[PDB]
Design an enzyme around this catalytic site. Structure first.
Site, mmCIF file in Angstrom:
data_model
loop_
_atom_site.group_PDB
_atom_site.id
_atom_site.type_symbol
_atom_site.label_atom_id
_atom_site.label_comp_id
_atom_site.label_asym_id
_atom_site.label_seq_id
_atom_site.Cartn_x
_atom_site.Cartn_y
_atom_site.Cartn_z
ATOM 1 C CG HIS A 99 -0.767 -0.094 2.458
ATOM 2 N ND1 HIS A 99 -1.599 -0.628 3.419
ATOM 3 C CD2 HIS A 99 0.372 0.265 3.106
ATOM 4 C CE1 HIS A 99 -0.993 -0.601 4.593
ATOM 5 N NE2 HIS A 99 0.203 -0.062 4.432
ATOM 6 C CG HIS A 124 1.167 4.653 6.825
ATOM 7 N ND1 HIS A 124 0.081 4.195 6.101
ATOM 8 C CD2 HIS A 124 2.038 3.621 6.898
ATOM 9 C CE1 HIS A 124 0.311 2.952 5.722
ATOM 10 N NE2 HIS A 124 1.486 2.577 6.204
ATOM 11 C CG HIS A 153 8.834 -1.643 3.561
ATOM 12 N ND1 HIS A 153 7.838 -2.592 3.691
ATOM 13 C CD2 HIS A 153 8.345 -0.507 4.120
ATOM 14 C CE1 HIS A 153 6.805 -2.062 4.324
ATOM 15 N NE2 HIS A 153 7.085 -0.797 4.591
ATOM 16 C CD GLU A 205 3.063 -2.369 6.144
ATOM 17 O OE1 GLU A 205 2.193 -1.675 6.697
ATOM 18 O OE2 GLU A 205 3.613 -2.035 5.068
HETATM 19 FE FE LIG Z 1 1.688 0.360 6.232
#
Ligand SMILES: [Fe+2]
Ligand SMILES: [Fe+2]
Lengths: 408, 404
Positions: free
Chosen positions: A11, A58, A191, A238
């Site tokens: 996302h 976020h 990441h 995540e």
């Molecule tokens: Fe995220």
């Protein structure tokens, strides 16, 4: 009440940027966008009524009060301002009725929730959704968002995310409407975007992760935060969110499409899963789960003169409750007393909501879905004692209500 | 690590109103205040370092985003403006270290939590606290508040509250410090403040509930919301919070005190329970539980160039994180670009904090405890791509970072 399948997709804000800059022809972004096409195709063909959409905010709409599992129960969501103004996309409709059914089932299964309305959905939702769904004027499905607090530790563990999904599966299937639901899992993959380790990636873990999530998801459930962050970078952890989605699907799935691209900081991946139905009847019937989700408030209707503040009521009374809640602001409440009509004319209240406020219709506000505590702010601000409100509710004079008490 | 006991007490703002208006003298309120005295003296004699404080917020600081178990992890709490201004009481101190520990334990025990800092504590806390503790200049103990979302259904089942209490007991016990902790469960008893049924009480139930809470609390664990609202009024149902507290104490307690008064809408009730410690050894040892809590992040110290956003770090970075969060507001972000220094002086940032922002000290901010998604915002508003940020992090020129 039928789950058709699920999709996993990264996302990153960069998906949205590449969509907006029209980089469909681009030498680097063309095979990336192509990677999304089967999901997009699948979604157009199958036409889910609702997508249950799992993402993390976020640090935009969720910061000072930061929850693990935040169910969006509201009527609609607009894109959140994340520091650069609001993206020009139409609002996506929610499903308060499905959301409330889901809340009841999940609480009955002892998951601890938060409920929210009115806040913007950030790029966690609108970045992939903009690329997977046509939205010239509206969106093709409703949404029930589930914001997962994956950023502030401690967070729930992998198995909890998984068990949430297992519960969520039965929740959706027991919903007594004959609608079709897709489940979405977003974020990932490898990441890390902070600190000296920033720029970390692990394609080999990413591929393995995708295989295991697809075909042996149970083998992931013992992974710890330290494990996932070692393998997939800090923010890469995540992927627990994908486990919650995977957990809501049939124990075996058909993997109709997967794709992987690593053009930049983040592994852009997608997975499309077709639900198979249940190989066997579930442990508890749809009918018995319904009666159980209802157990806490069963027979509540026999209590006269009572208006339980359940989700449906919170959604119905949201505009008016949000308005009166702002009385906790000195400027707003000053304006409420001195210039109420100017405050109404700026507001999004219906004429009927304005009317309830102007007439100080205490019982009528209770009936409409105003929660008592908001009315109580309104009373205090207007200098009206709570006793006057109670007497109103009771259809009595103040002294006659006071007579029902013990002491003056 | 030591649980001395708990108190149960009503949390109506009428208590604060009576205290603030000087009614220790009055015919109605004088007996009621005498009722608080055994708890007040007990707290003053026993000297708890911390009260774990169970309450609900009354649609003030919790509304658009409403959670079931909201753990206050911040440094301090001040009275919230509930629409009538900020009550004149000093800030009470939190305990971020104990809060952090509690969260790790409860999550290991599969309770899903919310963490919050910086928002006002409403009268659910400040009403009874201001009668039970001296507060002229400051408060005698620290507070860990747990805001329970009891107002928007569906809410956790009664057994879930109780079960929360059970794990909380183990979490506080295993806390590797020689401190004394008291547990507070507040709200109740019978009342209904909305609808045509407003003014309902049920003293028989209140007394029965209280006796059953003290001596046989497991007998209550099957009560539905309908049961509790029928017997105790719709808002009286918040007494599940007393259960949570009671679950946190020894299975056997000594009820040192019980009082009860019903002057107006709410049964104003207090209980004082003395913890009797653990009869047998616990199911899981204190050392094990500490290791089960730390597990999820055991080994994270090996991962270099990595700075996990733990509760301790969110507390440390809170003022600057909260400051840069405000960049989502169009007015705040304009000022930031046009008048940073004027915005800095009007903020509550430390010099260390403004300097980090002023110099765009990206890595320094990450070291300090600014979460990346706040720097992301900052960079975006300033018109600097994430790549320069990531390069700075990696201690590389943009071009040299691009290579990898
Ligand atoms: Fe995220
Ligand atoms: Fe309350």
């Amino acid at each position: 009440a039928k789950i058709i399948g699920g999709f996993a997709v990264s996302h990153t804000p960069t998906i949205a940027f590449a969509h907006d800059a029209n980089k469909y022809d681009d030498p680097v972004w063309a095979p990336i966008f192509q990677g999304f096409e089967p999901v997009k195709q699948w979604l157009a063909e199958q036409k889910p009524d609702v997508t249950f959409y799992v993402y993390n905010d976020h640090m935009t709409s969720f910061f000072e009060h930061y929850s693990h599992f935040a169910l969006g129960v509201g009527e609609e969501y607009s894109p959140a301002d994340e520091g650069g103004g609001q993206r020009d996309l139409p609002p996506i409709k929610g499903d308060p009725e499905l959301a409330k059914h889901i809340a009841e089932c999940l609480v009955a299964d002892e998951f601890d929730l938060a409920y929210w309305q009115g806040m913007g959905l950030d790029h966690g939702a609108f970045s992939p959704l903009s690329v997977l769904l046509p939205h010239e004027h509206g969106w093709p499905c409703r949404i029930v968002p589930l914001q997962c607090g994956v950023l502030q530790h401690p967070i729930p563990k992998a198995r909890r995310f998984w068990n949430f999904g297992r519960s969520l599966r039965r929740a959706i299937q027991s919903y007594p409407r004959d609608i079709k639901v897709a489940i979405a899992g977003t974020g990932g993959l490898s990441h890390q975007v902070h600190g000296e380790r920033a720029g970390f990636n692990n394609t080999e873990w990413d591929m393995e992760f995708m295989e295991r999530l697809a075909n042996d998801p149970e083998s992931l459930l013992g992974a710890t935060v330290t494990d996932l962050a070692k393998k997939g970078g800090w923010e890469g952890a995540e992927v627990v969110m994908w486990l919650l989605m995977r957990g809501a699907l049939s124990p075996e799935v058909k993997t109709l499409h997967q794709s992987y691209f690593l053009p930049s900081m983040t592994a852009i991946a997608t997975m499309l899963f077709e639900d198979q139905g249940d190989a066997a009847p579930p442990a508890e019937s749809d009918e018995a789960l319904r009666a159980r989700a209802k157990r806490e408030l069963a027979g509540v209707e026999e209590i006269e003169g009572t208006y339980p503040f359940t989700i449906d009521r919170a959604v119905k009374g949201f505009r008016i409750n949000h308005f009166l809640h702002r009385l906790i602001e000195p400027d707003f409440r000053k304006r409420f007393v001195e210039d109420p009509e100017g405050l109404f004319a700026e507001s999004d209240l219906t004429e009927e909501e304005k009317s309830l406020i102007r007439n100080r219709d205490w019982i009528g506000m209770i009936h409409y879905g105003v929660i008592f505590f908001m009315l109580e702010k309104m009373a205090a601000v207007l200098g009206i004692g709570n006793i006057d409100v109670y007497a109103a509710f009771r259809g009595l004079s103040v002294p006659e209500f006071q007579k029902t008490r013990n002491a003056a």
